[PDB]
Amino acid sequence: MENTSITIEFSSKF
């Protein structure tokens, strides 16, 4: 979503 919190929270967690 052009951010560094949600897109990273998922891309990292999973």
PDB file of C-alpha atoms in Angstrom:
ATOM      1  CA  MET A   1       0.000   0.000   0.000  1.00  0.00           C
ATOM      2  CA  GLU A   2       2.978   2.278  -0.646  1.00  0.00           C
ATOM      3  CA  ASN A   3       3.767   2.169   3.074  1.00  0.00           C
ATOM      4  CA  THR A   4       6.232   0.603   5.511  1.00  0.00           C
ATOM      5  CA  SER A   5       4.002  -0.840   8.234  1.00  0.00           C
ATOM      6  CA  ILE A   6       1.223  -3.013   6.814  1.00  0.00           C
ATOM      7  CA  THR A   7       2.971  -4.178   3.645  1.00  0.00           C
ATOM      8  CA  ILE A   8       6.016  -5.023   5.759  1.00  0.00           C
ATOM      9  CA  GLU A   9       4.060  -6.586   8.622  1.00  0.00           C
ATOM     10  CA  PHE A  10       2.662  -9.176   6.211  1.00  0.00           C
ATOM     11  CA  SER A  11       5.617  -9.515   3.840  1.00  0.00           C
ATOM     12  CA  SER A  12       7.740 -10.195   6.921  1.00  0.00           C
ATOM     13  CA  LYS A  13       5.361 -12.219   9.090  1.00  0.00           C
ATOM     14  CA  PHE A  14       4.549 -14.448   6.116  1.00  0.00           C
TER      15      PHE A  14
END
